[PDB]
Write a protein that binds this ligand. Structure first.
Ligand SMILES: *[C@@H]1O[C@H](CO)[C@@H](O[C@@H]2O[C@H](CO)[C@@H](O[C@@H]3O[C@H](CO)[C@@H](O[C@H]4O[C@H](CO)[C@@H](O[C@H]5O[C@H](CO)[C@@H](O[C@H]6O[C@H](CO)[C@@H](O)[C@H](O)[C@@H]6O)[C@H](O)[C@@H]5O)[C@H](O)[C@@H]4O)[C@H](O)[C@@H]3O)[C@H](O)[C@H]2NC(C)=O)[C@H](O)[C@H]1NC(C)=O
Ligand SMILES: *[C@@H]1O[C@H](CO)[C@@H](O[C@@H]2O[C@H](CO)[C@@H](O[C@@H]3O[C@H](CO)[C@@H](O)[C@H](O)[C@@H]3O)[C@H](O)[C@H]2NC(C)=O)[C@H](O)[C@H]1NC(C)=O
Ligand SMILES: CC(=O)N[C@@H]1[C@@H](O)[C@@H](O)[C@@H](CO)O[C@@H]1O
Ligand SMILES: *[C@@H]1O[C@H](CO)[C@@H](O)[C@H](O)[C@H]1NC(C)=O
Ligand SMILES: [Fe+3]
Ligand SMILES: [Zn+2]
Ligand SMILES: [Zn+2]
Length: 340
Protein backbone atom coordinates (compact mmCIF):
# COMPACT_ATOMS: atom_id res chain seq x y z
CA UNK A 1 0.00 0.00 0.00
CA UNK A 2 2.36 2.70 1.28
CA UNK A 3 4.75 0.83 -1.05
CA UNK A 4 6.30 2.43 -4.18
CA UNK A 5 7.33 0.60 -7.35
CA UNK A 6 10.27 2.37 -9.04
CA UNK A 7 10.90 1.91 -12.80
CA UNK A 8 14.50 1.19 -13.75
CA UNK A 9 15.73 1.64 -17.30
CA UNK A 10 18.09 -1.19 -18.30
CA UNK A 11 20.05 -3.75 -16.24
CA UNK A 12 22.49 -1.43 -14.36
CA UNK A 13 19.63 0.69 -13.04
CA UNK A 14 17.78 -2.52 -12.14
CA UNK A 15 20.71 -3.68 -10.08
CA UNK A 16 20.93 -0.35 -8.21
CA UNK A 17 17.18 -0.38 -7.64
CA UNK A 18 17.40 -3.91 -6.20
CA UNK A 19 19.94 -2.67 -3.64
CA UNK A 20 17.70 0.24 -2.73
CA UNK A 21 14.77 -2.18 -2.42
CA UNK A 22 16.65 -4.52 -0.05
CA UNK A 23 17.84 -1.63 2.12
CA UNK A 24 14.43 0.01 2.25
CA UNK A 25 12.82 -3.12 3.68
CA UNK A 26 10.69 -3.34 0.54
CA UNK A 27 9.19 0.02 1.06
CA UNK A 28 10.47 0.47 -2.48
CA UNK A 29 10.25 -2.20 -5.09
CA UNK A 30 11.49 -2.42 -8.70
CA UNK A 31 10.07 -2.83 -12.18
CA UNK A 32 12.46 -2.77 -15.17
CA UNK A 33 12.09 -1.77 -18.82
CA UNK A 34 14.51 -1.40 -21.68
CA UNK A 35 13.68 2.26 -22.43
CA UNK A 36 12.38 5.32 -20.67
CA UNK A 37 9.35 5.27 -22.98
CA UNK A 38 8.44 1.75 -21.82
CA UNK A 39 8.79 2.79 -18.15
CA UNK A 40 6.32 5.60 -18.82
CA UNK A 41 3.90 3.09 -20.21
CA UNK A 42 4.35 0.88 -17.10
CA UNK A 43 3.52 3.89 -15.00
CA UNK A 44 0.39 4.71 -17.06
CA UNK A 45 -0.79 1.10 -16.68
CA UNK A 46 -0.28 1.40 -12.94
CA UNK A 47 2.34 -1.40 -12.99
CA UNK A 48 5.06 1.01 -11.85
CA UNK A 49 4.62 4.20 -9.73
CA UNK A 50 7.46 6.53 -10.60
CA UNK A 51 10.85 7.28 -12.11
CA UNK A 52 13.13 10.31 -12.43
CA UNK A 53 13.11 11.90 -15.93
CA UNK A 54 15.01 14.38 -18.08
CA UNK A 55 12.80 17.36 -19.14
CA UNK A 56 12.43 16.03 -22.70
CA UNK A 57 10.73 12.95 -21.27
CA UNK A 58 8.68 15.00 -18.82
CA UNK A 59 7.14 16.58 -21.90
CA UNK A 60 6.22 13.12 -23.22
CA UNK A 61 4.91 11.90 -19.87
CA UNK A 62 2.98 15.15 -19.26
CA UNK A 63 0.92 14.83 -22.47
CA UNK A 64 -0.10 11.41 -21.10
CA UNK A 65 -1.21 12.91 -17.80
CA UNK A 66 1.79 12.22 -15.56
CA UNK A 67 2.90 14.95 -13.21
CA UNK A 68 6.17 16.27 -11.71
CA UNK A 69 6.48 15.28 -8.03
CA UNK A 70 9.90 16.35 -6.78
CA UNK A 71 12.93 17.75 -8.61
CA UNK A 72 16.67 17.10 -8.47
CA UNK A 73 18.43 19.92 -6.68
CA UNK A 74 22.23 20.20 -6.93
CA UNK A 75 24.46 22.27 -4.62
CA UNK A 76 24.39 26.03 -5.09
CA UNK A 77 26.21 29.35 -4.74
CA UNK A 78 23.21 31.52 -4.01
CA UNK A 79 20.00 30.82 -1.99
CA UNK A 80 22.27 29.42 0.73
CA UNK A 81 19.89 30.32 3.54
CA UNK A 82 17.28 27.68 2.67
CA UNK A 83 17.34 23.95 3.25
CA UNK A 84 17.85 21.81 0.12
CA UNK A 85 14.35 20.28 0.01
CA UNK A 86 12.76 23.75 0.10
CA UNK A 87 15.26 25.60 -2.12
CA UNK A 88 14.43 26.88 -5.68
CA UNK A 89 15.76 24.74 -8.60
CA UNK A 90 18.19 26.62 -10.75
CA UNK A 91 18.36 24.57 -13.94
CA UNK A 92 21.42 23.29 -15.73
CA UNK A 93 23.29 24.73 -18.67
CA UNK A 94 23.13 22.84 -21.96
CA UNK A 95 26.46 23.22 -23.82
CA UNK A 96 28.20 21.99 -26.92
CA UNK A 97 31.71 20.75 -26.21
CA UNK A 98 34.66 20.13 -28.47
CA UNK A 99 38.37 19.39 -28.17
CA UNK A 100 40.65 22.46 -28.16
CA UNK A 101 42.89 20.61 -30.68
CA UNK A 102 40.07 20.55 -33.20
CA UNK A 103 40.89 24.17 -34.10
CA UNK A 104 38.56 26.17 -36.29
CA UNK A 105 35.55 24.05 -35.41
CA UNK A 106 32.76 26.48 -34.34
CA UNK A 107 28.99 26.52 -34.11
CA UNK A 108 28.96 27.75 -37.75
CA UNK A 109 30.99 24.89 -39.22
CA UNK A 110 29.18 21.98 -37.49
CA UNK A 111 27.59 20.81 -40.74
CA UNK A 112 28.89 17.40 -41.84
CA UNK A 113 30.88 16.82 -38.63
CA UNK A 114 30.40 13.88 -36.19
CA UNK A 115 28.17 14.31 -33.15
CA UNK A 116 27.62 12.65 -29.71
CA UNK A 117 24.19 13.05 -28.08
CA UNK A 118 22.87 11.79 -24.75
CA UNK A 119 19.71 10.13 -26.27
CA UNK A 120 17.02 11.22 -28.75
CA UNK A 121 14.28 13.30 -27.03
CA UNK A 122 16.48 14.49 -24.11
CA UNK A 123 16.98 18.20 -23.35
CA UNK A 124 20.67 18.97 -23.69
CA UNK A 125 21.47 16.04 -25.87
CA UNK A 126 18.80 16.55 -28.46
CA UNK A 127 15.89 18.93 -28.12
CA UNK A 128 17.97 22.09 -27.62
CA UNK A 129 20.71 21.51 -30.23
CA UNK A 130 18.46 19.97 -32.86
CA UNK A 131 15.80 22.61 -32.26
CA UNK A 132 18.42 25.30 -32.86
CA UNK A 133 19.77 23.59 -35.94
CA UNK A 134 16.35 23.08 -37.45
CA UNK A 135 15.56 26.77 -36.96
CA UNK A 136 18.83 28.07 -38.38
CA UNK A 137 18.58 25.70 -41.29
CA UNK A 138 14.90 25.99 -42.24
CA UNK A 139 14.85 22.24 -42.81
CA UNK A 140 13.38 19.30 -40.87
CA UNK A 141 16.23 17.22 -42.23
CA UNK A 142 18.14 17.05 -38.91
CA UNK A 143 19.12 13.46 -39.78
CA UNK A 144 21.24 14.73 -42.64
CA UNK A 145 23.04 17.54 -40.80
CA UNK A 146 25.89 15.63 -39.14
CA UNK A 147 27.77 13.06 -41.23
CA UNK A 148 27.61 10.43 -38.46
CA UNK A 149 26.40 10.50 -34.85
CA UNK A 150 25.66 8.43 -31.82
CA UNK A 151 22.12 9.40 -30.75
CA UNK A 152 20.77 6.49 -28.70
CA UNK A 153 17.12 5.81 -29.48
CA UNK A 154 17.35 6.40 -33.25
CA UNK A 155 17.23 3.76 -36.02
CA UNK A 156 20.30 1.55 -35.47
CA UNK A 157 20.85 1.27 -39.26
CA UNK A 158 20.79 5.07 -39.79
CA UNK A 159 23.77 7.40 -39.63
CA UNK A 160 22.38 8.78 -36.35
CA UNK A 161 23.51 5.47 -34.73
CA UNK A 162 26.66 4.93 -36.77
CA UNK A 163 28.98 5.99 -33.98
CA UNK A 164 27.19 4.13 -31.13
CA UNK A 165 29.03 1.06 -29.89
CA UNK A 166 26.59 -1.07 -28.00
CA UNK A 167 27.87 -3.01 -24.90
CA UNK A 168 30.70 -5.36 -24.00
CA UNK A 169 29.72 -7.66 -26.94
CA UNK A 170 28.47 -5.13 -29.54
CA UNK A 171 25.02 -5.99 -28.68
CA UNK A 172 22.31 -3.39 -28.09
CA UNK A 173 23.94 -0.82 -30.35
CA UNK A 174 22.21 2.53 -29.93
CA UNK A 175 19.70 1.36 -27.32
CA UNK A 176 18.75 4.32 -25.12
CA UNK A 177 19.88 2.82 -21.84
CA UNK A 178 23.25 2.56 -20.06
CA UNK A 179 24.15 -0.73 -21.77
CA UNK A 180 25.03 1.46 -24.80
CA UNK A 181 28.64 2.70 -24.18
CA UNK A 182 27.89 6.23 -25.37
CA UNK A 183 24.50 6.70 -23.67
CA UNK A 184 23.66 9.61 -21.37
CA UNK A 185 25.65 12.62 -20.25
CA UNK A 186 28.67 10.49 -19.36
CA UNK A 187 28.46 8.33 -22.53
CA UNK A 188 28.23 11.29 -24.86
CA UNK A 189 31.13 13.08 -23.18
CA UNK A 190 33.11 9.82 -23.51
CA UNK A 191 32.23 9.70 -27.21
CA UNK A 192 33.92 13.11 -27.57
CA UNK A 193 36.83 12.24 -25.25
CA UNK A 194 37.78 9.15 -27.29
CA UNK A 195 37.57 11.24 -30.46
CA UNK A 196 34.73 9.19 -31.90
CA UNK A 197 32.76 12.39 -32.44
CA UNK A 198 33.76 16.01 -33.01
CA UNK A 199 31.16 17.56 -30.69
CA UNK A 200 29.16 16.39 -27.66
CA UNK A 201 25.89 17.95 -26.55
CA UNK A 202 25.82 17.58 -22.81
CA UNK A 203 25.53 19.83 -19.78
CA UNK A 204 28.08 22.04 -18.08
CA UNK A 205 28.45 19.77 -15.06
CA UNK A 206 29.44 16.75 -17.12
CA UNK A 207 32.72 18.35 -18.29
CA UNK A 208 33.75 19.26 -14.74
CA UNK A 209 32.74 15.85 -13.33
CA UNK A 210 34.81 13.88 -15.75
CA UNK A 211 38.04 15.88 -15.88
CA UNK A 212 41.08 16.79 -13.73
CA UNK A 213 40.88 13.63 -11.64
CA UNK A 214 37.18 13.88 -10.68
CA UNK A 215 36.25 10.55 -12.25
CA UNK A 216 39.01 7.93 -11.95
CA UNK A 217 37.43 6.02 -14.86
CA UNK A 218 40.08 4.67 -17.26
CA UNK A 219 38.82 6.71 -20.19
CA UNK A 220 38.68 9.96 -18.17
CA UNK A 221 41.64 9.59 -15.73
CA UNK A 222 43.91 11.70 -17.88
CA UNK A 223 41.38 14.22 -19.18
CA UNK A 224 42.17 17.91 -18.55
CA UNK A 225 39.56 20.70 -18.68
CA UNK A 226 41.96 22.87 -20.62
CA UNK A 227 41.86 20.39 -23.53
CA UNK A 228 38.20 21.28 -24.10
CA UNK A 229 36.26 24.27 -25.41
CA UNK A 230 32.53 25.19 -25.41
CA UNK A 231 30.91 26.35 -28.67
CA UNK A 232 29.04 29.67 -28.29
CA UNK A 233 26.06 30.64 -30.43
CA UNK A 234 27.92 33.74 -31.63
CA UNK A 235 30.60 31.71 -33.53
CA UNK A 236 33.22 31.96 -30.79
CA UNK A 237 34.93 29.26 -28.60
CA UNK A 238 35.50 29.62 -24.88
CA UNK A 239 37.03 27.72 -21.97
CA UNK A 240 34.72 25.56 -19.93
CA UNK A 241 34.98 28.13 -17.13
CA UNK A 242 32.81 30.50 -19.19
CA UNK A 243 29.66 28.37 -19.30
CA UNK A 244 27.48 31.17 -17.91
CA UNK A 245 28.29 33.23 -21.04
CA UNK A 246 28.53 30.38 -23.54
CA UNK A 247 25.62 27.90 -23.34
CA UNK A 248 22.83 26.86 -25.71
CA UNK A 249 20.15 27.24 -23.23
CA UNK A 250 19.20 26.65 -19.53
CA UNK A 251 17.36 23.36 -18.93
CA UNK A 252 14.79 22.47 -16.23
CA UNK A 253 16.17 19.98 -13.72
CA UNK A 254 15.36 16.26 -14.02
CA UNK A 255 12.35 15.38 -11.88
CA UNK A 256 10.38 12.48 -10.48
CA UNK A 257 7.06 11.93 -12.21
CA UNK A 258 4.12 9.76 -11.42
CA UNK A 259 0.48 9.29 -12.16
CA UNK A 260 -1.31 12.19 -10.62
CA UNK A 261 -3.51 9.90 -8.57
CA UNK A 262 -0.34 8.54 -6.98
CA UNK A 263 1.68 11.76 -6.61
CA UNK A 264 1.01 12.39 -2.94
CA UNK A 265 1.96 8.88 -1.87
CA UNK A 266 5.12 8.87 -4.03
CA UNK A 267 6.17 12.24 -2.55
CA UNK A 268 5.67 11.05 1.05
CA UNK A 269 7.72 7.90 0.57
CA UNK A 270 10.57 9.57 -1.31
CA UNK A 271 11.03 12.34 1.29
CA UNK A 272 11.51 9.57 3.90
CA UNK A 273 13.78 7.53 1.64
CA UNK A 274 16.09 10.50 1.16
CA UNK A 275 16.27 11.16 4.91
CA UNK A 276 17.67 7.63 5.08
CA UNK A 277 19.80 7.25 1.95
CA UNK A 278 20.21 10.87 0.80
CA UNK A 279 23.24 13.16 1.03
CA UNK A 280 23.28 13.42 4.80
CA UNK A 281 21.13 10.43 5.56
CA UNK A 282 21.03 8.05 8.49
CA UNK A 283 22.52 5.30 6.37
CA UNK A 284 24.03 6.84 3.29
CA UNK A 285 27.72 6.40 3.51
CA UNK A 286 27.39 3.32 5.70
CA UNK A 287 24.86 1.10 4.00
CA UNK A 288 23.37 2.59 0.83
CA UNK A 289 23.54 6.03 -0.96
CA UNK A 290 20.66 6.83 -3.28
CA UNK A 291 22.62 9.52 -5.15
CA UNK A 292 25.81 7.57 -5.94
CA UNK A 293 26.65 5.10 -8.76
CA UNK A 294 30.28 5.88 -9.68
CA UNK A 295 29.61 8.71 -12.21
CA UNK A 296 27.11 6.56 -14.03
CA UNK A 297 24.07 8.64 -13.03
CA UNK A 298 21.88 5.56 -12.35
CA UNK A 299 18.25 6.41 -11.30
CA UNK A 300 19.36 9.93 -10.33
CA UNK A 301 22.24 12.19 -11.32
CA UNK A 302 25.28 11.63 -9.10
CA UNK A 303 25.57 15.34 -8.41
CA UNK A 304 22.12 15.46 -6.77
CA UNK A 305 22.12 17.04 -3.30
CA UNK A 306 18.44 16.26 -2.60
CA UNK A 307 15.00 15.90 -4.21
CA UNK A 308 13.17 19.21 -3.67
CA UNK A 309 9.50 20.08 -3.31
CA UNK A 310 8.15 22.16 -6.17
CA UNK A 311 5.99 25.00 -4.77
CA UNK A 312 3.21 26.41 -6.84
CA UNK A 313 2.12 22.78 -7.48
CA UNK A 314 3.09 23.22 -11.10
CA UNK A 315 1.62 21.36 -14.04
CA UNK A 316 4.22 19.81 -16.35
CA UNK A 317 3.95 22.86 -18.62
CA UNK A 318 4.59 25.26 -15.77
CA UNK A 319 7.49 23.08 -14.59
CA UNK A 320 9.21 22.91 -18.01
CA UNK A 321 8.37 26.57 -18.64
CA UNK A 322 6.95 28.40 -21.65
CA UNK A 323 10.28 28.91 -23.42
CA UNK A 324 11.14 25.20 -23.41
CA UNK A 325 7.67 23.84 -24.22
CA UNK A 326 7.53 25.94 -27.35
CA UNK A 327 10.93 24.76 -28.44
CA UNK A 328 9.82 21.13 -28.22
CA UNK A 329 6.48 21.64 -29.95
CA UNK A 330 8.19 23.28 -32.91
CA UNK A 331 10.79 20.51 -33.16
CA UNK A 332 8.01 17.88 -32.91
CA UNK A 333 6.35 19.29 -36.07
CA UNK A 334 9.42 18.06 -37.88
CA UNK A 335 9.22 14.40 -37.02
CA UNK A 336 -1.90 6.47 -26.88
CA UNK A 337 1.76 6.63 -25.95
CA UNK A 338 1.09 9.28 -28.52
CA UNK A 339 -1.35 10.49 -25.91
CA UNK A 340 -1.33 14.00 -27.42
C1 LIG B 1 29.50 24.04 -14.17
O1 LIG B 1 29.47 22.85 -13.41
C2 LIG B 1 30.44 22.79 -12.40
C3 LIG B 1 30.50 21.37 -11.84
O2 LIG B 1 29.47 21.21 -10.89
C4 LIG B 1 30.09 23.86 -11.34
O3 LIG B 1 31.14 23.79 -10.40
C5 LIG B 1 30.66 23.53 -9.08
O4 LIG B 1 30.10 24.70 -8.53
C6 LIG B 1 29.75 24.64 -7.16
C7 LIG B 1 29.14 25.98 -6.76
O5 LIG B 1 29.56 26.96 -7.69
C8 LIG B 1 31.00 24.35 -6.33
O6 LIG B 1 30.61 24.39 -4.96
C9 LIG B 1 31.51 23.60 -4.18
O7 LIG B 1 31.04 22.30 -3.97
C10 LIG B 1 32.16 21.47 -3.84
C11 LIG B 1 31.74 19.99 -3.89
O8 LIG B 1 31.58 19.57 -5.23
C12 LIG B 1 33.01 21.87 -2.61
O9 LIG B 1 34.36 21.74 -3.00
C13 LIG B 1 35.00 20.65 -2.32
O10 LIG B 1 34.63 19.35 -2.75
C14 LIG B 1 34.76 19.17 -4.15
C15 LIG B 1 34.21 17.81 -4.59
O11 LIG B 1 34.61 16.79 -3.70
C16 LIG B 1 36.21 19.34 -4.59
O12 LIG B 1 36.20 19.43 -6.02
C17 LIG B 1 36.84 20.63 -6.53
O13 LIG B 1 38.08 20.94 -5.93
C18 LIG B 1 39.18 20.10 -6.26
C19 LIG B 1 40.29 21.02 -6.80
O14 LIG B 1 39.77 22.30 -7.11
C20 LIG B 1 38.87 18.95 -7.24
O15 LIG B 1 38.26 17.75 -6.72
C21 LIG B 1 38.43 17.34 -5.33
O16 LIG B 1 37.33 16.58 -4.84
C22 LIG B 1 37.18 15.27 -5.37
C23 LIG B 1 35.95 14.60 -4.75
O17 LIG B 1 35.77 13.30 -5.28
C24 LIG B 1 38.42 14.42 -5.12
O18 LIG B 1 38.31 13.18 -5.79
C25 LIG B 1 39.67 15.14 -5.62
O19 LIG B 1 40.82 14.41 -5.22
C26 LIG B 1 39.72 16.56 -5.05
O20 LIG B 1 39.88 16.47 -3.64
C27 LIG B 1 38.02 19.44 -8.42
O21 LIG B 1 38.85 19.86 -9.49
C28 LIG B 1 37.03 20.54 -8.05
O22 LIG B 1 37.48 21.78 -8.54
C29 LIG B 1 36.96 20.48 -3.89
O23 LIG B 1 38.32 20.10 -3.76
C30 LIG B 1 36.50 20.82 -2.48
O24 LIG B 1 37.21 20.04 -1.54
C31 LIG B 1 32.79 23.30 -2.06
O25 LIG B 1 32.40 23.22 -0.70
C32 LIG B 1 31.79 24.18 -2.81
O26 LIG B 1 30.59 24.29 -2.08
C33 LIG B 1 31.57 23.00 -6.78
O27 LIG B 1 32.80 22.66 -6.16
C34 LIG B 1 31.86 23.03 -8.28
N1 LIG B 1 32.17 21.68 -8.69
C35 LIG B 1 33.37 21.23 -9.08
C36 LIG B 1 33.58 19.75 -8.98
O28 LIG B 1 34.27 21.94 -9.52
C37 LIG B 1 30.02 25.25 -12.00
O29 LIG B 1 29.54 26.26 -11.10
C38 LIG B 1 29.10 25.22 -13.22
N2 LIG B 1 29.17 26.51 -13.90
C39 LIG B 1 28.12 27.27 -14.17
C40 LIG B 1 28.39 28.52 -14.94
O30 LIG B 1 26.97 26.97 -13.83
C1 LIG C 1 12.81 27.89 -33.26
O1 LIG C 1 12.06 28.95 -33.81
C2 LIG C 1 10.73 28.94 -33.37
C3 LIG C 1 9.87 29.84 -34.28
O2 LIG C 1 10.10 31.20 -33.98
C4 LIG C 1 10.75 29.36 -31.91
O3 LIG C 1 9.43 29.45 -31.44
C5 LIG C 1 9.09 30.78 -31.04
O4 LIG C 1 9.81 31.19 -29.89
C6 LIG C 1 9.44 32.41 -29.27
C7 LIG C 1 10.21 32.48 -27.96
O5 LIG C 1 9.68 31.53 -27.05
C8 LIG C 1 7.94 32.50 -29.01
O6 LIG C 1 7.57 33.83 -28.69
C9 LIG C 1 7.17 33.90 -27.31
O7 LIG C 1 5.79 33.55 -27.17
C10 LIG C 1 4.93 34.24 -26.26
C11 LIG C 1 3.53 34.21 -26.86
O8 LIG C 1 3.63 33.87 -28.23
C12 LIG C 1 5.37 35.66 -25.97
O9 LIG C 1 4.57 36.22 -24.95
C13 LIG C 1 6.82 35.63 -25.54
O10 LIG C 1 7.25 36.86 -25.00
C14 LIG C 1 7.58 35.27 -26.80
O11 LIG C 1 7.30 36.23 -27.80
C15 LIG C 1 7.10 32.11 -30.22
O12 LIG C 1 5.75 31.97 -29.84
C16 LIG C 1 7.57 30.82 -30.85
N1 LIG C 1 6.91 30.76 -32.14
C17 LIG C 1 6.06 29.81 -32.53
C18 LIG C 1 5.61 29.87 -33.96
O13 LIG C 1 5.64 28.91 -31.81
C19 LIG C 1 11.51 28.27 -31.15
O14 LIG C 1 11.63 28.62 -29.79
C20 LIG C 1 12.90 28.08 -31.75
N2 LIG C 1 13.59 26.95 -31.15
C21 LIG C 1 14.65 27.10 -30.37
C22 LIG C 1 15.22 25.87 -29.74
O15 LIG C 1 15.17 28.20 -30.16
C1 LIG D 1 9.56 30.03 -8.50
C2 LIG D 1 9.43 28.69 -9.18
O1 LIG D 1 8.47 27.95 -9.00
N1 LIG D 1 10.44 28.36 -9.99
C3 LIG D 1 10.40 27.09 -10.70
C4 LIG D 1 11.60 26.26 -10.24
O2 LIG D 1 11.39 25.81 -8.91
C5 LIG D 1 11.73 25.03 -11.13
O3 LIG D 1 10.60 24.19 -10.91
C6 LIG D 1 11.78 25.37 -12.61
C7 LIG D 1 11.67 24.09 -13.42
O4 LIG D 1 12.44 24.17 -14.60
O5 LIG D 1 10.69 26.23 -12.91
C8 LIG D 1 10.53 27.44 -12.18
O6 LIG D 1 11.65 28.29 -12.40
C1 LIG E 1 9.19 1.46 5.75
O1 LIG E 1 8.03 2.24 5.79
C2 LIG E 1 7.52 2.53 7.08
C3 LIG E 1 6.37 3.51 6.91
O2 LIG E 1 6.94 4.79 6.71
C4 LIG E 1 8.53 3.20 8.00
O3 LIG E 1 8.09 3.11 9.34
C5 LIG E 1 9.92 2.60 7.90
O4 LIG E 1 10.85 3.53 8.41
C6 LIG E 1 10.29 2.26 6.46
N1 LIG E 1 11.53 1.52 6.48
C7 LIG E 1 12.56 1.82 5.69
C8 LIG E 1 13.86 1.15 6.03
O5 LIG E 1 12.49 2.58 4.72
FE1 LIG F 1 18.93 16.30 -19.00
ZN1 LIG G 1 21.38 32.02 -21.15
ZN1 LIG H 1 0.02 26.60 -11.66
Amino acid sequence: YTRVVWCAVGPEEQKKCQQWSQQSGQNVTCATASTTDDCIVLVLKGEADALNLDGGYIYTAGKCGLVPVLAENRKSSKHSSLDCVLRPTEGYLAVAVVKKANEGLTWNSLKDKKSCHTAVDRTAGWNIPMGLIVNQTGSCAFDEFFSQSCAPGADPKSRLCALCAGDDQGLDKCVPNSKEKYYGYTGAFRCLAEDVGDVAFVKNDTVWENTNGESTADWAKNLKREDFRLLCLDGTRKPVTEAQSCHLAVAPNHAVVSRSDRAAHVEQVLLHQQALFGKNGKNCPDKFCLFKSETKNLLFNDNTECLAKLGGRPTYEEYLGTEYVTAIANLKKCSLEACA
